[PDB]
């Protein structure tokens, strides 16, 4: 059929693209471009994973982006996708993820009487559709040009090549019930944009006592990088001057540099709404935050005079190193394994190439606390929406792009470490993930270290946990599960093991399987009071 | 004097359990912590049945299965963000069974949406078309003097929600996104500073009273021509009809006791059809809907009639009959109904090796009167249908909606808690009414995470998972090697007691006392199974 | 003071200082706060404030105050049909690109639902055509958190500023700035004064946000045999100069090389810059239909338009080596000297007066410093075959969707903003004059336009030339200027120059009377001496 | 073809009571079936150049003694200019149908009507054409009882 050359274009086009790994569900009807997809797979143009769960597939396609920063495709084929891919669509529109949604509309069809819901009008960077292919013989021409410039329109919008602000993108090609025509020479895209150059400078006098807070899509600026700075995880670190989040409350920041999109800690909230201080906010693309309208300006880059007062530098390094002592003080004089524990164990044992998959409640923010050195190092986390939901399937796509940028080097060495820190609320919602078939890439070099606290240990450091409600608190926030992550696990055929914070180091050393989960069984029940010991002692 | 989010959520929650709520969801959150904390208080109180989940998207189904074991509104409350989103695929099914679901989310206030403000998105409007309302309540304001006027606005605003969900105006139940901003302070103040909810309508009633409605539209069609009857989800009750012969879906209410196997449809020729409900099932019944010759009279309960057939010469509530069948029409149609039971009977029997169809049929054989059968939306349902299950005196279960894959574990569940809650509220010293699922490995596996209930939550008395396990175009790849899940080792990772058994032994380990929950796994065979069917019908 | 009017007036404050400078009114009770404020920001001379009845025609009156300064310009109206009736002008600024806030009251969200009076789904009533659809937060009665609110406000306030501006994004646009108000809606008696929130000091908005720019430079080899397109939107590029270039009117003339439409048919170029969004002529949608020529699409906004197929690249300014081939330019301007040549010759010897001739003599009549205002449909299209030469005039035309409607409305706010900002210059220079061309049929669909209130801004240059060809009805012109008091006269074509050189009587109306019968075989004509 | 899709939709909305039909010029063979009804008599077509003043038109007529009527969009400036009349329908609960063909927006239609039905592409093939006349006519059916309220009472 002329759909079939239709398909065999689209991918063509989307694989000149840039695009390596598409995933896939099976469905009722035929997924779009299905076969193209099938022929592109044994060729080893593209790389097909196969999920039966829809929602988990969405989220290993978060992860196949930001893995190693390239679109990736979902092809849809059920009246139940789009409901299961609207998690994995709202966080790629937040987190700015290049995802490419392939859908298959059918025009012959009577529609008023592809189960539509109403975030596709809100969350998509474009909805591009392609008409249906016509068996017009002699304007192949025209048509390769029509399909292949709408590809590169779609591949545009879904990574921010004019726009600077990646996201999802709904592409559909329509399908009636049932020799490629080429592209340019060289393999180059039909319609060429470069990446646009998005520019915006400020005016930022740093001898005023400076505070660099940077949060997720926070970009790298090197006239920045003596300022103390209180970096989020996933934040590329511009220097070599870090300010531990829990000796930022210590400080009286003069003005703030913020980066990119803060969303951890409550004191950096204090500080980024006191209208008594400046904020700045410096971002990669035209979105920028504010928190209780204090942003005073936005901009892409500081253009900097002045240079910051040595006692102000001296004061930060101090307040710092308490920080730093108090928390490492407290860990020790700590009898039961907490979140923090492990997290502490988990940075320690990190090495530059590494990855690093983080999720939500605790475990971020135990690893900011635990003063983790990001440099060298990628750490990717769902930082848009900050849900517990997908996050296995986010580290297995991370670790399976993240392993083929590697390969493709062609370095004889063994594929970098993915390490996975999540808990055992993130890893039951999303256990499923571990189902990958023996027909689909499965990664070689990724360790799931699941923090097991039998509940949300962040819920005992908020208000709701506070004693007086510690009779009503444990059915609704601590939520205890008593699941056997062993045999979860076991059931699913992935390697398992149950070892203490102490093994955690030495067994991170020893390569294994190429997916492992190691879990750690910890405490939430003194952790309110842990965290109280540190500022006490800070 | 209670903080604005505190007097709020108590209002709230006390103006749902006003309205028939019995159960509600609840998955964990900070931002719905004022939800939350009037939630426990309630079940404390007895006055509602709380369960909590992890998963938001598996509380959906839960909350589907607790409205349909007992026909009641359902609540399910959770967080801001992608957890209202989870909530996707269970508010779909709930639109198209007609499900009473109510999605209470938490949110951020709506002025943060666009500031980049932490785990805040578009969720009002996030369901579009697939709910019946969206409504949002006000950010709760710190006014003591407009107390009584925030009240009012509360509790009639959640009326709208339970009426819109209920159908009690529209007759078409379905769920309604209930948005409920909410700020800081989140917990509530110490109880030294207390103070009264602010009070409903006295004697326990609604602040808006709807009597459930009804909704009539009569229809003319002569029995004496030639008439099957075909009866699908959703379908009403016909006294006037049930001497016809009848096609019914299992998940259908049987109006008579004339019924009519699917594969004799075929072969027979009716000169005119009644359907009844929604029918989706059977392939001949799709068939035979999109014969324009055939004239076809719709009856549903509510205002959606079904577009499967397109020679639809009326769509009505309630048959106004005339005439009656000829004798001999029903004489033929008793006849080919006995003959397709018969070939099916015989080529199971024939044919050696257990496959779905016969764990199907094992079920079948083993149901008694008030019992409960949850099915799995996919082969389940049509084996049943096949092995020819009498359903009467028997309540069957199945999301046939949009007949997904997802939560199926999740909705037997809440069905078991539902049925048996409304067992309890009789008085009856009787034991707990059973409640069996029939589900395919590839199903259980897909919603195994439903079976995770937390220590303290509600289990079922009485429920008994059958799991038909037959480890069983690019993408269909995966099914072509088996998945290869240990059911076993699943369940023990839920703390579920499962036991393989064999088709011989499902009859008698059923009739077994309920142990609370537990897993029966037969395995099968798929490889035989397109010789079954080709036999069966060479057989008719 | 309540609450909705300290509102009001924070928002309002922080508009000014965003460079706001004309705001359009429409009477409601809903958007009283907001009349107040807004009044009250008039009368001190911080803005200037244009009142109408009907507010789809306020739309228009806003997109030609927008497009006649470049400055964002506010509608406020009140709830109900108001904000559906902006509906047509909203399609049209997020096309043309026009910085557009709709300022709308509204009943409290908590009222949706309850079958209220003039309540409906109001916020993402416009659903994608406008850049960002923001509600400020209900005001609450809380003076301890009255500096709290202030800096929200005024962050929301800058946030819709920015994204009709494209302040950051480069794509300017339509924004939805809708305000829950509850009573009391009027200002409670204001003894002495009232202290209304100060926003940041020097008059600075809240947010500063510096200018942008976005850069997409691609290489183009200008040796290559290469036409250049230039649409509605089009940039500045003076490294093209020298090219060939087929400009729409509203696009601005980078260069001293024109190439008549008409001339494009006979030339068979081997490359095509397209600038900004070419849709007026057929000849160019055929070249671009081509994909044997290679397209390179120059924009100032990330939207690049999808007319041609053969798209090799997109950006948004070229990186340039070579230079035209001599026989090229030749061949080109040659082409051009025979299209000129045809459209005049056959003008000429026509014995009728058609569009086309009252389009020319508009053309002639016209002087630099002027603005031409153009109906989006024939007018844009006969002034074009005509040649106007718009180097040194500014020419606006409703190009988004080149509807009918709200022309007369946006040659009315487009004078009016074109002289204000004439007025800031200083310069004791009578006002500059703006002529708008359009055709009897736009004329008599948007009449309703000339009605301005007795207090209302009128135009002091503007003059409406009527082309009435009787269909683009048997309406009687001068009748509907007499209903709305405007000055109006029939004159002949020949009298359009002298009349137009008569100094501007405030809003005059000029209806010359046009044949269509005999308009197929005058192109005909034109189209055989090619 | 198409041709044929708009004589059986034309002819089973005067089926379903539609009297009068506002349609508005514009561009965008379905304003050729209602030319062929009108000139035979069996519905009165009533053109207007303001769109929106063509949605007031319509709402009048269906007010005026109760039946449903239609308006024809033809342009890229209709569904804005509808938009005014189709809120009013809405909440005055007008049997209004607004028809639009478009070739294989704003918000206010996901908010606003009782039903949005698209009949889909007319496939040349006679071999099924008894079908095609079933399933035009049954969604022209679904859309006049959708815009009376004939089975919700919400017209
Ligand atoms: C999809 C989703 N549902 C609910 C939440 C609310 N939430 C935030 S943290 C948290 C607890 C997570 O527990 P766990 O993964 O065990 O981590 P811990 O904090 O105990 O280390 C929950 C439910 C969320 N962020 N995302
Ligand atoms: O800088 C980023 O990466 C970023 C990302 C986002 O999704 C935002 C959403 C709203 C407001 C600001 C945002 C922002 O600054
Ligand atoms: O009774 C009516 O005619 C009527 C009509 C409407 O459009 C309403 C809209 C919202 C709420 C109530 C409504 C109502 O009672
Ligand atoms: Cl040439
Ligand atoms: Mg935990």
């Not at 059920?78 to 409901?83: D, E």
């Not at 392609?130 to 013989?137: K, S, T, Y």
Request: net charge neutral; glycine share 10%.
């Amino acid at each position: 059929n002329p759909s079939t050359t239709q398909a065999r274009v689209v991918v063509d086009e989307l694989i000149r693209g840039g695009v390596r790994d598409v995933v896939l569900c099976p469905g009722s009807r035929n997924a779009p471009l299905a076969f193209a997809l099938q022929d592109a797979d044994r060729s080893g143009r593209i790389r097909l994973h196969v999920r039966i769960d829809e929602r988990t597939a969405g989220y290993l396609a978060i992860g196949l982006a930001i893995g190693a920063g390239a679109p990736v495709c979902v092809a849809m084929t059920s009246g139940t996708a789009v409901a299961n891919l609207g998690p994995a669509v709202v966080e790629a529109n937040y987190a700015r993820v290049p995802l490419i949604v392939l859908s298959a509309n059918r025009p012959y069809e009577l529609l008023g009487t592809m189960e539509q819901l109403g975030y596709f009008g809100t969350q998509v960077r474009a909805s591009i559709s392609l008409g249906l292919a016509e068996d017009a013989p002699e304007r192949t021409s025209a048509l390769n040009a029509t399909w292949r410039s709408a590809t590169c329109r779609v591949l545009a919008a879904a990574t921010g090549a004019r726009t600077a602000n990646a996201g999802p993108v709904h592409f559909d090609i329509p399908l009636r019930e049932p020799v490629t025509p080429p592209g340019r020479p060289a393999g180059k895209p039909w319609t060429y944009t470069p990446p646009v150059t998005f520019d915006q400078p400020l005016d930022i006098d740093l001898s005023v006592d400076t505070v660099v807070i940077s949060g997720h899509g926070a970009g790298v600026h090197p006239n920045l990088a003596a300022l103390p700075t209180v970096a989020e995880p996933t934040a590329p670190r511009s220097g070599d001057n870090p300010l531990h989040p829990l000796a930022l409350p210590l400080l009286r920041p003069q003005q703030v540099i913020m980066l990119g999109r803060p969303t951890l800690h409550r004191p950096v909230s204090v500080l980024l709404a006191d209208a008594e201080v400046p904020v700045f906010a410096l971002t990669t693309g035209p979105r920028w935050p504010a928190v209780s309208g204090n942003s005073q300006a936005t901009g892409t880059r500081a253009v900097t005079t002045g240079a910051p007062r040595p006692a102000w530098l001296d004061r930060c390094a101090a307040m710092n190193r308490h920080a730093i002592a108090a928390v490492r003080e407290q860990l020790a004089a700590h009898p039961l394994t907490t979140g923090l524990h492990v997290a502490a164990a988990v940075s320690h044992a990190l090495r530059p190439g590494d990855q690093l998959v983080l999720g939500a409640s605790n475990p971020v923010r135990d690893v900011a606390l635990a003063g983790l050195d990001t440099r060298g190092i990628r750490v990717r986390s769902n930082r848009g929406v900050a849900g517990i939901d997908g996050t296995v399937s986010t580290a297995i796509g991370a670790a399976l792009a993240y392993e083929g940028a590697h390969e493709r080097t062609g370095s004889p060495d063994s594929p970098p470490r993915t390490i996975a820190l999540i808990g055992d609320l993130t890893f039951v919602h999303d256990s499923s993930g571990l189902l990958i078939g023996p027909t689909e890439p499965i990664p070689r070099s990724l360790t799931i270290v699941v923090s097991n606290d039998n509940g949300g240990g962040i819920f005992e450091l908020l208000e709701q946990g506070d004693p007086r409600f510690s009779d009503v608190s444990s059915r609704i926030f601590g939520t205890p599960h008593d699941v056997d992550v062993g045999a979860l696990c076991r059931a699913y055929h992935v390697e398992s093991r149950q070892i203490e914070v102490d093994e955690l180091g030495p067994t991170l050393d020893q390569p294994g399987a190429g997916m492992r989960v190691l879990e750690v069984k910890a405490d939430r029940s003194s952790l309110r009071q842990l965290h109280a010991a540190i500022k006490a002692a800070l």
